[PDB]
Ligand binder design. Sequence first.
Ligand SMILES: [Zn+2]
Lengths: 4, 138
Amino acid sequence: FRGK
Amino acid sequence: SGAIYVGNFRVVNRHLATHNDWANLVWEDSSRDLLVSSTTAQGCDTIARCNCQTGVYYCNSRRKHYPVSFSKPSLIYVEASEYYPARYQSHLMLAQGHSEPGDAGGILRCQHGVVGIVSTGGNGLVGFADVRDLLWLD
Ligand SMILES: [Zn+2]
């Protein structure tokens, strides 16, 4: 998934 | 933000969790990308008790609120990232919309309260982790  | 604050609970994306989160762990699920930790202060959010499939979420990369329509929560195959191997993610709601690295953590709301949190995205889709089944949060 995400979180960057 | 980047987090849902309800009751004495802090809800975040599991891969965005801090050390303090794990130290104060209440509950986590890799397959949902969710982690909940305890707080001392009382939180201001309420989890939506509904089956709404439209709402508004905050997009980090754009710095804007966007109205969105999203599918009912489901098992979705998600490609490897630097946070997980390729896997099935459960309770993932999908939407058409703009999506970038760093948008995870944006909160999705309807008129009933908090519905979920951006977890994944790509190929013109934004993936939201549904939190409405977590009735014990309220
Ligand atoms: Zn609703």
